[PDB]
Each structure stands twice: as C-alpha cells, then as structure tokens.
Amino acid sequence: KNIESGVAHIHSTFNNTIVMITDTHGNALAWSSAGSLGFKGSKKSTPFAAQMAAEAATKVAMEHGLKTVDVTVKGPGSGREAAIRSLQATGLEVTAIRDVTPVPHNGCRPPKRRRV
Amino acid sequence: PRKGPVAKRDVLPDPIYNSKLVTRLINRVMVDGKRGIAANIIYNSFDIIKESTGNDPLEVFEQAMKNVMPVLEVKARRVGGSNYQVPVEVRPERRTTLGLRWVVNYARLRGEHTMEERLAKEIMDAANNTGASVKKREDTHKMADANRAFAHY
RNA sequence: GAAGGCGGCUCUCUGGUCUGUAACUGACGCUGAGGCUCGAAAGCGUGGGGAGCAAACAGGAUUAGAUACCCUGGUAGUCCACGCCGUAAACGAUGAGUGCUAAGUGUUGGAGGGUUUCCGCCCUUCAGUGCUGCAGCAAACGCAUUAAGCACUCCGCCUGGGGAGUACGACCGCAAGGUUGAAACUCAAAGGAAUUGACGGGGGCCCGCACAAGCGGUGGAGCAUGUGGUUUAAUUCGAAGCAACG
Ligand SMILES: [K+]
Ligand SMILES: [K+]
Ligand SMILES: [K+]
Ligand SMILES: [K+]
Ligand SMILES: [K+]
Ligand SMILES: [K+]
Ligand SMILES: [Mg+2]
Ligand SMILES: [Mg+2]
Ligand SMILES: [Mg+2]
Ligand SMILES: [Mg+2]
Ligand SMILES: [Mg+2]
Ligand SMILES: [Mg+2]
C-alpha cells in the first residue's frame, strides 16, 4: 500500500518498451508501455514513447508511495536511456542500474534470418 | 539551392507606420505589382482597425502576428520506404512569412465585400486569438505534437 | 583428424602426429587397378525422445496474380540406439611419394646453445599453419620451399557444345535413388582470362527551377490557333516522346 524502495524493469525491444515498477520482492506495483499510452506502429519503439511510459508508471508508483528504485534494463530497445532519464526527472531516485538482457550460452536455435 | 544559403534582400520601412513588417504585408497582399492598390488597402484596413478599437493598428497587427506565427511546423521526411512528418522549430523568418501568408489568405477567404474590411476583421480576430489564421496555427501545432515522437530526427 | 569432421566439464578404453637420441633391423620402401573400410546434410526402417527451429500445411498480408519473399502458428525432420543409404561448390574447384631452387615477417608444438638471478631476451634448428615476395612458370588471373618452378615413380581422369549423366543392359539399395553408361539427331560454335564502353532497384563525390520553398499557371468554360481522327472532288506536302503539334 505504501513503499519506499523498488525495482523498475524496462523491457525495451525493437517494437515496444514496457516499464514495470515492482517492490523489491518482484510484486508488481505499477506499469505502463508505449502501447498503453496510445502510441502505435513505429512510435511505440521511439525513445520518446519510452520517456512517456516511464513517466506515467513513475507517477503511478509515486502515488502508491515510492521514493527510490533500482533500474533493470532488458532488450536492445533504444528507449532505455530515455526511460531512465524520465524516471529520474519524474522523481524516483535511481539508486542503481543493471542490464539483464538474456544471453543464452548457445542453447536454443534462433529463428531463420528475415528475407531469405 | 545546392550551392548553399542565398542572400536575403531587405525591405524599407513603411512611409507612414515606419514598419518593415507593414511593407512586407503590403508586398504579400500585392498582386501583379499593383503596389499602390496594395498599400491603399493596407492603410484603409488599418484605419478600420483604429476606428473599431482604441488600440494602435500597428500594435493590433503585431498582436495578430504573435497569435498566428507558428513555433513548430511539420516537414515530411522520407526514410527508406516510409515517409512521415517530423516536427521542426520554425526559424523566425519563416515564422513571419507564415504569419503574413496565413493572414492574407484567410482575409481573402473571408466573406466581407471589400479586401480592407476582410483584412481588418481577420487581423482583429487574430489579435483576439481567434479566427481562421489562429486555427491554422493551432492545427500546425497539433500536427507537430502528434508527430512529436520523431523529434530525434 | 586421411577425409567427412571434431568446441561445456569429468573418468574409462583408444588411434595418430611431432621433437630429441642413435641402441636396434638392414631397403623391410612409394604407388596401388580390382577389392575393402570410413564418408556432411537430406532421406529410409525399427524403437525411443521431442524444448527451440522448421519442409509440408493453415491463416494474415503484398500483388494484376503471389501455389513466394514478409507476419502468426505448425507436422515430418532436426536429438538418441541400431541398421541402411554413399551423394555434396564431399573445394585449396590443385592425387600420392621423393629430391632441389632467393629471401622478409607472423603464429602453433618441440630441441639445442649465449646471455639473463629466474622470467625474459638473441642465435640456430625441426614439424605445421598464415601473409608478402625473387628465379621460374602462366592465356591471364596469379602460384612461388604449404609451387601452379625444376625433376623421377605409380594411380585416377580429359579429348567441341547440346542430346545426357539421358536411354538400354547390368550391379547395389526397403525405397528414394547410387555406380557403369551410349546412340540417333543437331550447331559452328560452347568455353577460360582479361580490356573499352554501356548499364545496376552498387558505392562515393558533385552540378542544374531537378527536387525542396513560394508566386503564377494548364487541365474545368467560350474563343483563336496547330495537330490527330473522321469527312470530302480536294480537304496539297513536310514535322511525330523529350528534341511534332501559334
Ligand atoms: K596419445
Ligand atoms: K528417422
Ligand atoms: K614458419
Ligand atoms: K557431336
Ligand atoms: K488551353
Ligand atoms: K495532337
Ligand atoms: Mg543426419
Ligand atoms: Mg515461417
Ligand atoms: Mg560427385
Ligand atoms: Mg613454415
Ligand atoms: Mg517544388
Ligand atoms: Mg482547358
């Protein structure tokens, strides 16, 4: 109901960026996305859309009550820095930043190349 | 052109209002080089403005310019197979040009009988922050905001 | 590692290679038709397994059409054991063995020495792997102690293009197909390398009211005029995208 510390996960792919503020235990608190803010097609992948989504999720989390968060970035999306700066500007204190992009140690076979 | 930026020719201030802006307005409203007709129209419209309101017509006109001159325009950019609009800050010269062009076009589109009457009405509406020119500026800003996601371009 | 190919770590079994020494045998060697063995991927049989991917297939897009490219799913297969299949641009598109013919410089595994307190640094040398480059070779491209140079031994293979790796026969295979393999007929070319242009939905750099920014137009109307078509006794002839049509 009221929190002080949290984790902001930014899953930013080439098509869309989702921002999810959870408690330190991984229980979701608030979330937003470029698609959730009405952006469509290319705009969903733009850095600006990441900024707006991060702002909205930050506002919801802060209304829930939240001062500091640590950021976990995932995916190769371009909007990661935009979302981070959006969080900081909106107020959440970004204590630490980490990249959690999955890196298979070979493992599973990826799909075929496009246009072949 | 390809070579680079071109020299811009300056204009002289108006004989009575001492306003290069007024001279530019006369030039914009001029047709087929009938500058006498254009200047008479502009001065008659300014007199109409001074009669209809207690404010200096020059100040009313500058109020209209302040209310009509855009700040962010949309320029079409073709990237690969995708062509989309991109917001762009309007340099002051193009701002003034757009203001004058919009004012003159919507004055000509107005419904009153005489051009000076139409122009005075449009100028006063723009000063009051209403009318076709103000709507045009608002729509330009709306388009820029809609395409604002492409600012990095 | 002969090749195909082999990439987490551990242990068991196991092959080969290389460097020294010079104790041993004393030419015992090379090649090798026919044979035998291995032989990517796909494929086949039996029985398992099955996450991701993905022929086929389904749907959605695109398009004139789209039995494709693109997107969403998705069966065989991809994995394992055993057994078939024996084909690949199975390529260094370069059989194996041996000897000789400038150097320069990387790197891999050793050996020896001269320093170096050791490390390390220098020289030499052996066997691989690369790049550069003499002589020589080559049609040229280029190769050049890892020859495509100079030589000898053996094996395989070639004799214009198509027909055709097809037909018949034969052998192999569960099958798919593999191996061997013509002829009739037909053409005066096919082909390799390189050169000059032209072109490219290749690249790079430039210019032009070429585009972009504006102004004004045409296309709509009446008429003038030229052209086409049609008509006519004739509607004289020429001009036909830009670059014919006041
Ligand atoms: K061994
Ligand atoms: K099988
Ligand atoms: K060497
Ligand atoms: K022949
Ligand atoms: K015309
Ligand atoms: K014509
Ligand atoms: Mg297989
Ligand atoms: Mg697919
Ligand atoms: Mg063969
Ligand atoms: Mg060597
Ligand atoms: Mg233009
Ligand atoms: Mg017309």
Description:
This is part of a larger assembly, with chains A (116 residues) and B (153 residues). Chain A has helices at 47-64, 80-90, and strands at residues 5-12, 17-23, 28-33, 68-74, 93-99. By secondary structure, chain A is an alpha/beta fold. In chain A, helix 1 runs parallel beside helix 2. The termini of chain A are far apart. Helices cover 56% and strands 10% of the residues of chain B. Chain B is built from 6 helices and 2 strands. Chain B has helices at residues 20-29, 35-52, 57-68, 92-109, 115-127, 132-146, and strands at 72-79, 82-89. Chain B has a two-stranded antiparallel sheet with strand order 1-2. The longest helix of chain B has 18 residues, at 35-52. The relative contact order of chain B is 0.15. Chain A binds chain B through residues 39, 42-43, 46-49, and chain B through 82, 84, 148-152. Chain A binds one RNA strand of 246 nucleotides through residues 105-112, 114-116. Chain A: It comes from Enterococcus faecalis (Streptococcus faecalis). Chain A: GO terms for molecular function: rRNA binding; structural constituent of ribosome. Chain A: One of its GO terms (cellular component) is ribosome.
Set down the secondary structure blueprint.
This is part of a larger assembly, with chains A (116 residues) and B (153 residues).
Chain A: E1 5-12, E2 17-23, E3 28-33, H1 47-64, E4 68-74, H2 80-90, E5 93-99
Parallel strand pairs in A: 1-4, 4-5
Antiparallel strand pairs in A: 1-2, 2-3
Chain B: H1 20-29, H2 35-52, H3 57-68, E1 72-79, E2 82-89, H4 92-109, H5 115-127, H6 132-146
Antiparallel strand pairs in B: 1-2
Helix pairs in contact in B: 1-2, 2-5, 3-5, 4-5
Bound molecules: potassium ion (K) (6 copies) and magnesium ion (6 copies).
The structure holds one RNA strand of 246 nucleotides.
